[PDB]
Amino acid sequence: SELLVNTKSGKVMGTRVPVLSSHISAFLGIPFAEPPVGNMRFRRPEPKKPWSGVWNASTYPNNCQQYVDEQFPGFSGSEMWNPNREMSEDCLYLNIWVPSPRPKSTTVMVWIYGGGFYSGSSTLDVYNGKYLAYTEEVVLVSLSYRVGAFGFLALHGSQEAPGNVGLLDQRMALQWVHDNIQFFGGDPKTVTIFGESAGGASVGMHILSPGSRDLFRRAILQSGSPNCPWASVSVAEGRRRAVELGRNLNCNLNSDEELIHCLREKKPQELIDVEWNVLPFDSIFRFSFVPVIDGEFFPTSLESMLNSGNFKKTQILLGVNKDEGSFFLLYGAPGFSKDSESKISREDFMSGVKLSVPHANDLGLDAVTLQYTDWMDDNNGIKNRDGLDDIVGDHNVICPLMHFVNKYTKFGNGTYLYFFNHRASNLVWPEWMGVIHGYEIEFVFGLPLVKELNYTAEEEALSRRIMHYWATFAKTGNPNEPHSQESKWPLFTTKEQKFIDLNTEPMKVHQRLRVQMCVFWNQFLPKLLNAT
Amino acid sequence: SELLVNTKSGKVMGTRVPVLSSHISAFLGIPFAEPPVGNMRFRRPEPKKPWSGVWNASTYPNNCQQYVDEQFPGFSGSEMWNPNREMSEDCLYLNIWVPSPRPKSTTVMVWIYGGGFYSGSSTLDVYNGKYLAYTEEVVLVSLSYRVGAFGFLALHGSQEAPGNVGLLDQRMALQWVHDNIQFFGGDPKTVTIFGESAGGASVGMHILSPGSRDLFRRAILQSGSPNCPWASVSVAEGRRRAVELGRNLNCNLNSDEELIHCLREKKPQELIDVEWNVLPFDSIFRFSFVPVIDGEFFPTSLESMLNSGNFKKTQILLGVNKDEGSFFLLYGAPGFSKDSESKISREDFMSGVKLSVPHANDLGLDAVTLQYTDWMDDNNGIKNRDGLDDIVGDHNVICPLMHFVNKYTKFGNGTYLYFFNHRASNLVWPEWMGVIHGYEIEFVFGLPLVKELNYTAEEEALSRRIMHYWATFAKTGNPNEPHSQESKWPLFTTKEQKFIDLNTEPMKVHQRLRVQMCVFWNQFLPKLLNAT
Ligand SMILES: c1ccc2c(NCCCCCCCCSc3c4c(nc5ccccc35)CCCC4)c3c(nc2c1)CCCC3
Ligand SMILES: c1ccc2c(NCCCCCCCCSc3c4c(nc5ccccc35)CCCC4)c3c(nc2c1)CCCC3
Ligand SMILES: *[C@@H]1O[C@H](CO)[C@@H](O[C@@H]2O[C@H](CO)[C@@H](O)[C@H](O)[C@H]2NC(C)=O)[C@H](O)[C@H]1NC(C)=O
Ligand SMILES: *[C@@H]1O[C@H](CO)[C@@H](O)[C@H](O)[C@H]1NC(C)=O
Ligand SMILES: *[C@@H]1O[C@H](CO)[C@@H](O)[C@H](O)[C@H]1NC(C)=O
Ligand SMILES: *[C@H]1O[C@H](CO)[C@@H](O)[C@H](O)[C@H]1NC(C)=O
Ligand SMILES: *[C@H]1O[C@H](CO)[C@@H](O)[C@H](O)[C@H]1NC(C)=O
């Protein structure tokens, strides 16, 4: 049977799913690791023991335990990111969409979801891989990994809670794909890992980590890079937050063994209830439990690795959205609301700056403020609003990615950069939020092709073009169709630094993306904070 | 006789001079102080002992001893600023142009020449007061004062070389005008002091100094303000440069009396030959002997005086030119030449920045560099050239004046601000230099009215308009003609901060002159240098 596949871990039975008037095979909920439950909580994942019989892979698996957004109950804009399956620590599974008839050895794409390392699910409707798998004829895989304290509590030195285990979950899934995707018609030597936000950061981390490099061919990073200020902490900061977490649950803190033991007896929701109380500063765009520079997964600092070319050298395709920072301002900055234009006063602008660069002294705050203020019109609510939006997106997403791309390109084998600036016509979020963090995803997964979701014809065309770019890149290392009559997405070079816009208008090539602001964030500000 | 005037110091005989097909009286070379020669060198000026008989005031006096620009021998552009009379320490004289028939009690305007406090003459063709005196019917006075070490060598504590004596020369001339201008038909209660560059700074200094306030009614400052970074030094820096000057002339340095004595035996040219060797840094737009915050002429720091409103409160009219910094770059920055477009390389730009902000550390230099660099086109020679030009003008002239005007306006009784951006059609300097430091002067003195100088009709009209603004302001404290049909030059207020452009085009009102850059120079940079 086309729905029956014999893997090295055992037999699996998929289900035939309908897609754009056709069908394909879907193997949902395939286990790739032993449930990280009980004394296994916080531990490195263990490969799933092979099973006898046939594993029923007809339905989605549980989503990992995570904080649930209730800011706008029932609002689709936010609900679409929340777990749509029951939560459970028994959540290490992967899903596979396979073209029908089953391919023999085709391009494979593995999706890593974002969610600030504290949330995320591989089962979201917006991550449905059937459209992409079907349209581009690729074997699409979406993995899962532990988030929150469960995936990133770090107590360096102990083997019970070493940290980075969520990244190891990802790696194990990639190991499984490398070992078994061939049986699903996938070519293990042509696997592209791709993800957005924390998932984009993750992809970058697998590019850096020696232990992950050999498990994939190329990579795509969307609105995220390994060097993002929110993507990692030092072993010292990690330990401090772990201890503070224990302190929030009245844990004995005399030893790691003591702390770990206590944390393991707590119910999932007990950890989630206090998870945000460990942040060192009053901030936005900062998450409690994230990857840690432990000297193992990452041998040295990320910057020294990037400088010395200590990373996998292959081709990469990455980019950012126009208004990466709007969502976090909405959720955590005074003066921003979902149902108003959110014109910001000068006072709220200053408050916003303080929240956005939590690690800065007064001189630093003054530098940022000066950089983003039009002094000929400083009390303009729109300009103040948009200014804060840029500060957040530039500092947390765009500039970190630009630093990564420039460092990578020096040693890499091909870079393709994009700037997504199309505001979807059916967008439910307010206009002031613009082109939102994460809203390029629906185009990458081809949702616009579904009439019921009512996008415009132009948007359907954009999605098809984006899907073909992603899949062609995954297949060849070049998003451009060889001998095509279409406009060519140019390579990004250390010299020209070219990139393209991704929207419903005729492709346009630009250079030095957000260079003026990124020189400030990547060169000047750090030097300033270092000296002062 | 109309050319004979009996003053409290003695009788003076002027000469009838032709002007625009008419005539007026000119009393040139009137002494207002005893020659500051011999043991009087470096000393405070002494009032001129009254004389018996008639003083011949038919010809210009000698110019004070000063450095002479020989960079472009014969070039009118630079020669027009050099002494056009014989130099001598016996140079404390003033000139007076009087309408004919002699007025009874008319508006008086006293000109204070610039020249970085190290040079300058009241006899330059560009300072000929006959056009202004004739056209606007005012008694025009141009004074003189010691410059260089002669006027500003400062050894605080000693009464032989106290410092600021050049400013005291100016004050004595103003005292003379207050005491005798009535005999020339001038109204001593309606005297406006005006000057450009160091002369503009001087005007501001008389506004601040308690000992000068009562000697004039209102003021006009052109391309200069008291708080300019080059306009003054601390008593400590003043003493250091005095000692270093002595060290350059192999003087005994065991005591002030010793140093002073030695310096007094040197010929004028001996001091001038080493005058520039005492500057602490490799810089541009910095002069060796300038006013000193001694605690006498200026009771406290200039900034505290400005903050507390410790200054004369009256009306003021002031402004700057579009390209204040070009001249100094030409003379002291690598890559600039009179006969080329002076497109600057990135290296020369950096060299220029270092020379322009001599008192800054690396972080400071980086801040300036970042502020004036277009990172989307950093190797553009024109942009680099123009960028440096703005750095020099903004830092040394415009921003200091904007800080002064804003501080003054809080306590003042009326402020009128202008931005001169007309490039004269007969300008001999290269195009890249733009609207040059000091080139608004010829319009203020009405040279365009002289056909032989071949300006355009538009420029003649501009000059007449500027002359009428200056004289009307001097007469009433408002440059605007009451009940006029002409566009109104609006008051500058702390709230609106309005100003006008001064050129051959229809008057246009703007607000917050160079505010973006001045917030950098007046608020951010200082804070940065203070912290780091
Ligand atoms: C990728 C992945 C997720 C996306 C998405 N996720 C919702 C993001 C909400 C970010 C703002 C932080 C919200 C949680 S703050 C917080 C708190 C607490 N506990 C927490 C515990 C865990 C995480 C956050 C917690 C308790 C004290 C009160 C605050 C959203 C968007 N894009 C995404 C793209 C676009 C806007 C809608 C939300
Ligand atoms: C008001 C007053 C004067 C103006 C005017 N004066 C010429 C300004 C030249 C400025 C650059 C500094 C030139 C002297 S540097 C110098 C040196 C030395 N000694 C000096 C001694 C005194 C003063 C400067 C000295 C010896 C070592 C070599 C250098 C010029 C301009 N505007 C002016 C407006 C516009 C450009 C033409 C020159
Ligand atoms: C300059 O000062 C004069 C008075 O010293 C100001 O005029 C006075 O204004 C107040 C309030 O506006 C009136 O109550 C007085 O009757 C006015 N006195 C006279 C003699 O007019 C004038 O407003 C000030 N100008 C500026 C720009 O500050
Ligand atoms: C598991 O497979 C069975 C058929 O073997 C079928 O009921 C369904 O696809 C799965 N179970 C659930 C959740 O209904
Ligand atoms: C001084 O006045 C005399 C006439 O008294 C006349 O020669 C001339 O105006 C002046 N002297 C000079 C320099 O010729
Ligand atoms: C688009 O269809 C109708 C309007 O034509 C609208 O009511 C519906 O909510 C939209 N579909 C979705 C996916 O919300
Ligand atoms: C203007 O007149 C002629 C050209 O018409 C020119 O040669 C002369 O130099 C100019 N006059 C001046 C003041 O230089």
Tab-separated table of C-alpha atoms in Angstrom, chain B residues 129-303:
chain	number	residue	atom	x	y	z
B	129	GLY	CA	30.608	101.885	5.663
B	130	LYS	CA	29.699	104.654	3.224
B	131	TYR	CA	27.103	102.654	1.280
B	132	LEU	CA	25.199	101.595	4.391
B	133	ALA	CA	25.536	104.975	6.108
B	134	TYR	CA	24.367	106.740	2.955
B	135	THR	CA	21.576	104.386	1.890
B	136	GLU	CA	20.002	103.867	5.310
B	137	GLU	CA	20.955	107.213	6.853
B	138	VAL	CA	22.755	105.848	9.893
B	139	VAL	CA	25.998	106.867	11.553
B	140	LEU	CA	28.182	103.837	10.814
B	141	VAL	CA	31.157	103.150	13.082
B	142	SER	CA	33.790	100.453	12.645
B	143	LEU	CA	36.132	99.910	15.582
B	144	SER	CA	39.391	97.998	15.920
B	145	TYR	CA	40.983	95.842	18.597
B	146	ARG	CA	44.195	93.945	19.232
B	147	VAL	CA	44.281	90.367	17.936
B	148	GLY	CA	46.663	87.445	18.345
B	149	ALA	CA	48.859	87.297	21.437
B	150	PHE	CA	48.763	91.115	21.445
B	151	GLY	CA	45.073	91.094	22.242
B	152	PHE	CA	44.560	87.775	23.990
B	153	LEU	CA	47.712	86.431	25.650
B	154	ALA	CA	46.300	85.349	29.012
B	155	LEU	CA	48.191	84.842	32.270
B	156	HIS	CA	45.409	84.982	34.834
B	157	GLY	CA	46.498	86.564	38.092
B	158	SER	CA	48.959	89.067	36.619
B	159	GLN	CA	47.869	92.591	35.772
B	160	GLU	CA	50.454	92.933	33.002
B	161	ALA	CA	48.834	90.290	30.765
B	162	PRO	CA	45.376	89.541	32.273
B	163	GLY	CA	43.896	88.380	28.984
B	164	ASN	CA	40.769	89.564	27.142
B	165	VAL	CA	42.351	93.003	26.537
B	166	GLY	CA	41.240	92.808	22.899
B	167	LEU	CA	37.657	92.637	24.152
B	168	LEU	CA	38.424	95.596	26.402
B	169	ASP	CA	39.678	97.493	23.333
B	170	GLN	CA	36.254	96.926	21.782
B	171	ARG	CA	34.532	98.067	24.960
B	172	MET	CA	36.600	101.256	25.124
B	173	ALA	CA	35.635	102.070	21.544
B	174	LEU	CA	32.003	101.506	22.534
B	175	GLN	CA	32.540	103.784	25.548
B	176	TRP	CA	33.923	106.439	23.203
B	177	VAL	CA	30.880	106.090	20.922
B	178	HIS	CA	28.537	106.333	23.911
B	179	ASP	CA	30.398	109.459	25.045
B	180	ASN	CA	30.970	111.251	21.713
B	181	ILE	CA	28.750	109.963	18.898
B	182	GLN	CA	26.199	112.678	19.722
B	183	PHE	CA	28.553	115.274	18.222
B	184	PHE	CA	28.453	113.437	14.885
B	185	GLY	CA	24.671	113.406	14.840
B	186	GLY	CA	24.392	109.947	16.340
B	187	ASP	CA	21.948	108.909	19.050
B	188	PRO	CA	23.978	107.194	21.809
B	189	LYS	CA	20.829	105.571	23.174
B	190	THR	CA	20.207	103.801	19.873
B	191	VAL	CA	23.503	102.043	19.133
B	192	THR	CA	23.505	98.599	17.536
B	193	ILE	CA	26.709	96.584	17.685
B	194	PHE	CA	27.163	94.082	14.863
B	195	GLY	CA	29.939	91.799	13.670
B	196	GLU	CA	30.664	88.575	11.808
B	197	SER	CA	32.445	85.402	12.912
B	198	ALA	CA	34.818	86.316	15.796
B	199	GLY	CA	33.118	89.707	15.608
B	200	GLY	CA	29.755	88.025	16.008
B	201	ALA	CA	31.163	86.090	18.957
B	202	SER	CA	32.423	89.414	20.354
B	203	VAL	CA	28.970	90.974	20.111
B	204	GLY	CA	27.609	88.021	22.064
B	205	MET	CA	30.369	88.465	24.632
B	206	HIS	CA	29.414	92.120	25.188
B	207	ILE	CA	25.824	90.968	25.666
B	208	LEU	CA	27.052	88.618	28.408
B	209	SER	CA	29.675	90.787	30.111
B	210	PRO	CA	28.139	93.053	32.812
B	211	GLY	CA	30.805	95.664	32.096
B	212	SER	CA	29.713	96.085	28.463
B	213	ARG	CA	25.903	95.746	28.583
B	214	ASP	CA	25.123	99.419	29.219
B	215	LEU	CA	27.167	100.652	26.262
B	216	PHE	CA	24.762	99.628	23.472
B	217	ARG	CA	21.066	99.188	22.703
B	218	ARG	CA	20.728	96.100	20.520
B	219	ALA	CA	22.822	93.546	18.659
B	220	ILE	CA	23.352	91.654	15.421
B	221	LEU	CA	25.470	88.482	15.250
B	222	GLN	CA	26.576	87.119	11.874
B	223	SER	CA	27.988	83.586	11.652
B	224	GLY	CA	29.195	83.600	15.237
B	225	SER	CA	28.121	83.366	18.863
B	226	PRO	CA	29.930	83.683	22.233
B	227	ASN	CA	29.635	79.966	22.968
B	228	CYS	CA	31.457	78.827	19.813
B	229	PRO	CA	34.020	76.082	20.632
B	230	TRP	CA	36.823	78.199	19.151
B	231	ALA	CA	35.812	81.515	20.749
B	232	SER	CA	37.229	80.991	24.245
B	233	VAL	CA	39.481	78.942	26.524
B	234	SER	CA	39.818	78.343	30.259
B	235	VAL	CA	42.319	80.347	32.303
B	236	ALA	CA	44.353	77.158	32.593
B	237	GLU	CA	44.533	76.574	28.819
B	238	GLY	CA	45.250	80.263	28.279
B	239	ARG	CA	48.186	80.150	30.686
B	240	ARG	CA	49.534	76.974	29.069
B	241	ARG	CA	49.558	78.561	25.598
B	242	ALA	CA	51.188	81.727	26.953
B	243	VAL	CA	53.967	79.656	28.515
B	244	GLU	CA	54.310	77.559	25.358
B	245	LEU	CA	54.564	80.772	23.337
B	246	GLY	CA	57.395	81.875	25.590
B	247	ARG	CA	58.996	78.462	25.213
B	248	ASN	CA	58.935	78.942	21.419
B	249	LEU	CA	60.877	82.191	21.773
B	250	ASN	CA	63.345	80.776	24.298
B	251	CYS	CA	61.965	82.861	27.145
B	252	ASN	CA	62.835	82.552	30.818
B	253	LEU	CA	59.762	80.812	32.221
B	254	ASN	CA	60.405	81.053	35.964
B	255	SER	CA	57.661	83.636	36.521
B	256	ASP	CA	54.903	85.560	34.756
B	257	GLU	CA	56.913	88.753	35.200
B	258	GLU	CA	59.827	86.928	33.587
B	259	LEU	CA	57.734	85.561	30.711
B	260	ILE	CA	55.886	88.835	30.119
B	261	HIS	CA	59.113	90.857	30.123
B	262	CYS	CA	60.633	88.544	27.528
B	263	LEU	CA	57.544	88.589	25.311
B	264	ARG	CA	57.532	92.388	25.455
B	265	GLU	CA	61.068	92.603	24.057
B	266	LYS	CA	60.193	90.543	20.995
B	267	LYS	CA	59.334	92.276	17.736
B	268	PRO	CA	55.721	91.909	16.554
B	269	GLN	CA	56.600	89.475	13.767
B	270	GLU	CA	58.519	87.225	16.170
B	271	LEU	CA	55.337	86.476	18.091
B	272	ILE	CA	53.342	85.957	14.902
B	273	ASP	CA	55.983	83.576	13.520
B	274	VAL	CA	55.322	81.014	16.296
B	275	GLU	CA	51.742	81.899	17.276
B	276	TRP	CA	50.283	78.724	15.756
B	277	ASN	CA	52.716	76.379	17.522
B	278	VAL	CA	50.805	76.559	20.810
B	279	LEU	CA	47.587	74.834	19.717
B	280	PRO	CA	47.086	71.692	21.826
B	281	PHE	CA	45.720	69.539	18.997
B	282	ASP	CA	46.092	68.926	15.281
B	283	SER	CA	42.953	70.762	14.270
B	284	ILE	CA	41.100	73.223	12.113
B	285	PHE	CA	38.885	76.081	13.181
B	286	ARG	CA	40.825	76.575	16.416
B	287	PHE	CA	42.850	79.692	17.154
B	288	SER	CA	45.678	80.228	19.625
B	289	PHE	CA	44.827	83.447	21.487
B	290	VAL	CA	41.159	83.984	22.136
B	291	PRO	CA	39.008	85.311	24.995
B	292	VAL	CA	39.358	83.569	28.348
B	293	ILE	CA	36.685	82.762	30.937
B	294	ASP	CA	38.497	84.763	33.608
B	295	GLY	CA	35.717	85.339	36.105
B	296	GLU	CA	35.885	89.091	35.473
B	297	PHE	CA	34.878	89.978	31.922
B	298	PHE	CA	32.733	86.831	32.140
B	299	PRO	CA	31.681	86.279	35.796
B	300	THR	CA	30.963	82.541	35.399
B	301	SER	CA	30.963	79.927	32.631
B	302	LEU	CA	29.155	81.042	29.493
B	303	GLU	CA	26.671	78.178	29.765
